[PDB]
Amino acid sequence: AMEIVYDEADLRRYFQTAVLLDHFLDDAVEVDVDAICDGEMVLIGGIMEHIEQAGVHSGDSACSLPAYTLSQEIQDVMRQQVQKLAFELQVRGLMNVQFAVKNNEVYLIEVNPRAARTVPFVSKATGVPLAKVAARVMAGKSLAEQGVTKEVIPPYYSVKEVVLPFNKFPGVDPLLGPEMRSTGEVMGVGRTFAEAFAKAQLGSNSTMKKHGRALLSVREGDKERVVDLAAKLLKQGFELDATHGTAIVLGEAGINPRLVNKVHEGRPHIQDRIKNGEYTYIINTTSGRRAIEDSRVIRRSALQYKVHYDTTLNGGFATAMALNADATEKVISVQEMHAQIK
Amino acid sequence: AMEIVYDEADLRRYFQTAVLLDHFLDDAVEVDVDAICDGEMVLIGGIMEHIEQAGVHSGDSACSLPAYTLSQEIQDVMRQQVQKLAFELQVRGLMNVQFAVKNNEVYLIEVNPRAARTVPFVSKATGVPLAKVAARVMAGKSLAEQGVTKEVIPPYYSVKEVVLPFNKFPGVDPLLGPEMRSTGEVMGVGRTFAEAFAKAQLGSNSTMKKHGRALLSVREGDKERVVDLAAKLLKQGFELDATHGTAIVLGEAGINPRLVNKVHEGRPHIQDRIKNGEYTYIINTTSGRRAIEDSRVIRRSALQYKVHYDTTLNGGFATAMALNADATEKVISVQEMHAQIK
Numbered sequence: 008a009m010e011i012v013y014d015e016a017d018l019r020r021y022f023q024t025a026v027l028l029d030h031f032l033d034d035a036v037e038v039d040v041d042a043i044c045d046g047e048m049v050l051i052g053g054i055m056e057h058i059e060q061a062g063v064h065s066g067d068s069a070c071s072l073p074a075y076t077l078s079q080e081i082q083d084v085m086r087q088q089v090q091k092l093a094f095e096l097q098v099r100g101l102m103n104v105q106f107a108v109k110n111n112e113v114y115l116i117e118v119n120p121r122a123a124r125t126v127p128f129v130s131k132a133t134g135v136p137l138a139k140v141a142a143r144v145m146a147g148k149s150l151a152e153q154g155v156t157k158e159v160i161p162p163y164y165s166v167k168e169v170v171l172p173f174n175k176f177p178g179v180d181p182l183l184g185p186e187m188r189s190t191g192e193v194m195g196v197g198r199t200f201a202e203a204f205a206k207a208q209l210g211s212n213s214t215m216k217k218h219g220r221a222l223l224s225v226r227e228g229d230k231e232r233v234v235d236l237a238a239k240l241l242k243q244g245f246e247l248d249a250t251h252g253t254a255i256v257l258g259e260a261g262i263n264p265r266l267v268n269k270v271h272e273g274r275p276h277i278q279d280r281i282k283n284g285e286y287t288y289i290i291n292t293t294s295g296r297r298a299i300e301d302s303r304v305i306r307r308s309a310l311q312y313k314v315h316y317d318t319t320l321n322g323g324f325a326t327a328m329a330l331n332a333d334a335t336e337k338v339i340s341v342q343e344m345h346a347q348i349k
Numbered sequence: 350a351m352e353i354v355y356d357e358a359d360l361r362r363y364f365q366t367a368v369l370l371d372h373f374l375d376d377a378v379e380v381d382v383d384a385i386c387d388g389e390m391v392l393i394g395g396i397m398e399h400i401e402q403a404g405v406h407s408g409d410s411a412c413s414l415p416a417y418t419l420s421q422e423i424q425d426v427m428r429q430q431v432q433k434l435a436f437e438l439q440v441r442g443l444m445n446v447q448f449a450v451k452n453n454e455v456y457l458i459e460v461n462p463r464a465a466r467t468v469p470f471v472s473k474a475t476g477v478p479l480a481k482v483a484a485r486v487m488a489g490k491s492l493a494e495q496g497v498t499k500e501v502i503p504p505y506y507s508v509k510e511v512v513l514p515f516n517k518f519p520g521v522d523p524l525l526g527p528e529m530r531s532t533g534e535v536m537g538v539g540r541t542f543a544e545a546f547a548k549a550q551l552g553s554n555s556t557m558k559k560h561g562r563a564l565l566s567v568r569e570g571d572k573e574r575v576v577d578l579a580a581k582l583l584k585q586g587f588e589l590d591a592t593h594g595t596a597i598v599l600g601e602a603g604i605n606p607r608l609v610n611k612v613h614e615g616r617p618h619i620q621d622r623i624k625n626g627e628y629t630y631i632i633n634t635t636s637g638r639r640a641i642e643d644s645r646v647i648r649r650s651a652l653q654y655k656v657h658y659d660t661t662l663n664g665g666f667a668t669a670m671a672l673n674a675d676a677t678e679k680v681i682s683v684q685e686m687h688a689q690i691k
């Protein structure tokens with residue numbers, strides 16, 4: 008049971024219900040890097056930039072291949088670091104490295120000297136049978152002999168999205184965290200990131216609509232950013248609703264959402280509205296055990312009433328960008344995909 | 350110490366704190382009636398409809414001659430009740446009657462068998478020197494004999510507004526109630542109620558503006574009428590702020606004010622905003638001792654910073670109308686006014 012502790016009090020509190028201790032890189036981009044090491048050289052299979060930030064298990068984050076926001080200069084740090092790590096541990100075959108980017112600063116989160124659950128996606132994305140290769144490598148044939156020496160960078164956008172079992176265990180709080188709960192995955196391919204993403208979202212069984220009313224209820228650290236997001240939804244013709252504190256910040260920015268009541272606050276409240284088909288979209292962020300626990304009802308209602316919802320601001324943005332795309336506009340075969348690869 | 354208690358708890362509460370017990374006529378129109386009785390007949394000198402409802406001392410209420418909302422039918426009833434009273438108590442000279450209208454029903458508040466403070470204004474408004482006339486009657490000269498037998502209903506509107514000393518005693522909660530606190534009064538003469546009012550308002554040293562942002566923070570009972578108020582303001586070009594509860598009702602009605610925190614809710618709050626010059630107008634109603642005591646800050650801030658404020662919705666509405674008039678437009682002398690009385 009891993010948990011993010013915010014303060015001293017918090018510490019104890021976990022401790023009771025309860026040891027490695029790590030500092031939580033808040034407001035960090037999480038990255039996945041799959042690579043092969045033949046001993047001579049190192050092939051970078053792919054660099055995946057997660058939509059959801061560090062603190063939300065790789066296993067449950069959507070991810071984009073190539074990175075949709077990261078700087079070449081930084082990818083480059085990780086590129087260099089992995090190489091460094093590959094040779095150092097003596098990687099003979101596949102490997103995976105997970106980083107965390109915070110303030111143009113690369114932090115090593117973990118190294119998995121084996122096949123990661125990211126390979127296939129990465130293989131599909133790049134047209135490079137990553138496993139076959141490391142397989143051939145482990146046995147004795149080099150990256151060099153394989154003529155599999157250069158790192159591929161597709162002409163298109165490959166986004167990976169996950170599917171969660173929440174609907175099977177309704178008593179659970181359908182919320183993202185440090186622990187993985189997802190069962191499967193989908194892949195979205197688009198000319199643009201927004202395209203790919205919309206593809207991955209539709210593919211993941213999302214109920215997200217392109218119209219109606221959105222509900223914004225975010226955590227403190229998300230209050231600043233939520234503005235742009237809200238701006239985006241307004242531009243798309245979404246009508247807005249917001250909880251008190253979230254409504255405060257919005258207003259301070261020229262945006263006047265409809266104020267909605269929390270459960271304990273009166274009527275009607277979020278639950279009633281949700282239940283009444285009042286929303287087509289919900290952006291809900293929450294931080295801290297107690298808070299989470301207290302906000303449970305919205306997520307539960309949302310899931311239950313099939314309202315598309317995001318539990319990360321990063322995830323809200325993606326959802327928004329995707330509103331500008333048409334996931335049924337254009338299809339492309341995988342063979343065509345790899346054909347496009349020079 | 351004259352207070353209005355709402356519930357049993359309230360009763361006691363006062364009782365510890367502190368006997369005549371009267372049923373409070375909530376949401377009632379207060380009226381003043383000045384008249385003369387020569388024992389032979391009764392002369393109606395003036396029927397004044399207060400802007401502020403019963404519960405706000407007559408002396409601190411703005412008022413209009415002729416009535417601006419009362420039905421002729423209801424006024425006529427009053428006129429008869431006055432007559433009755435006059436005769437019965439043996440009035441010989443001036444008299445004054447105070448009523449409350451609730452649900453198309455007339456209630457007697459009190460009877461002051463003497464010259465009331467409304468006498469000068471009524472005189473000015475009607476061109477009839479009630480004091481002189483009444484003095485005559487007292488002296489033996491009858492109404493018939495003096496040739497003053499018909500009630501005068503002027504061709505223009507006369508609005509009286511008061512001035513309060515709260516500024517002199519910053520420590521006092523600048524709020525209206527059942528006890529009189531005002532030191533003076535002014536008169537506004539207009540072709541319409543809106544005009545008389547605007548004139549009365551301006552002469553009262555009101556800092557009211559015709560543009561800007563308005564703060565709405567009203568009590569439960571006022572939550573319903575507030576919407577129309579908000580609309581009217583919106584129409585006038587004003588922008589809107591509002592406290593939580595008030596915002597909620599507004600939202601439900603299609604009005605999305607900009608949310609503002611209560612002093613104790615955090616920042617940014619009303620005090621901050623008021624202080625910073627965000628508002629040009631403030632509409633704040635509050636009921637019940639504790640509630641009053643708690644909101645005190647909003648009223649104290651409004652005054653200190655010179656923002657125009659109304660503590661009654663009836664007042665807020667009058668203000669609203671006045672926005673549609675120009676007190677600097679037309680001027681009229683008393684002589685001219687009296688001359689129009691045919």
Ligand SMILES: Nc1ncnc2c1ncn2[C@@H]1O[C@H](COP(=O)(O)OP(=O)(O)O)[C@@H](O)[C@H]1O
Nearest residue numbers: 029030031032037060061062063064065117185
């Ligand atoms: N120090 C940290 N700061 C931020 N996020 C972290 C940190 N450690 C772990 N995480 C998050 O938790 C996830 C799981 O941690 P990780 O060490 O990779 O565990 P696992 O072995 O279960 O895959 C990561 O994918 C990441 O989102």
Ligand SMILES: Nc1ncnc2c1ncn2[C@@H]1O[C@H](COP(=O)(O)OP(=O)(O)O)[C@@H](O)[C@H]1O
Nearest residue numbers: 371372373374402403404405406407458459527
């Ligand atoms: N029963 C009542 N219902 C509503 N308002 C009332 C009632 N009794 C008095 N008031 C309010 O209190 C004020 C003062 O009461 P009043 O009997 O006229 O006392 P005073 O001797 O001060 O003139 C009135 O002008 C009115 O606004």
Ligand SMILES: O=c1[nH]cnc2c1ncn2[C@@H]1O[C@H](COP(=O)(O)O)[C@@H](O)[C@H]1O
Nearest residue numbers: 224250251252253269270292293301302
């Ligand atoms: O009905 C509720 N009860 C408790 N918490 C809620 C409820 N609805 C939303 N929240 C949480 O409220 C937070 C936003 O609060 P705000 O700061 O007042 O806008 C988010 O972290 C939400 O998950």
Ligand SMILES: O=c1[nH]cnc2c1ncn2[C@@H]1O[C@H](COP(=O)(O)O)[C@@H](O)[C@H]1O
Nearest residue numbers: 566592593594595611612634635643644
């Ligand atoms: O800063 C404050 N502290 C306490 N009460 C306030 C404050 N500002 C406004 N009020 C009161 O809040 C009421 C409106 O509350 P609302 O229903 O949440 O909008 C009014 O009756 C106001 O007098």
Ligand SMILES: NCCC[C@H](N)C(=O)O
Nearest residue numbers: 067068069316317318322
């Ligand atoms: N990639 C995880 C699934 C996303 C889900 N809508 C959430 O934001 O909670």
Ligand SMILES: NCCC[C@H](N)C(=O)O
Nearest residue numbers: 409411658659660661664
């Ligand atoms: N007629 C009394 C003055 C009104 C004041 N603006 C208030 O509404 O409190």
Ligand SMILES: [Cl-]
Nearest residue numbers: 176177178179
């Ligand atoms: Cl369950």
Ligand SMILES: [Cl-]
Nearest residue numbers: 518519520521
């Ligand atoms: Cl003082």
Ligand SMILES: [K+]
Nearest residue numbers: 037059060063
């Ligand atoms: K992540």
Ligand SMILES: [K+]
Nearest residue numbers: 117118119120
């Ligand atoms: K691991």
Ligand SMILES: [K+]
Nearest residue numbers: 379401402410
């Ligand atoms: K009154």
Ligand SMILES: [K+]
Nearest residue numbers: 447459460461
């Ligand atoms: K009296």
Ligand SMILES: [Mn+2]
Nearest residue numbers: 065105117119
């Ligand atoms: Mn991991």
Ligand SMILES: [Mn+2]
Nearest residue numbers: 407447458459
């Ligand atoms: Mn009285």
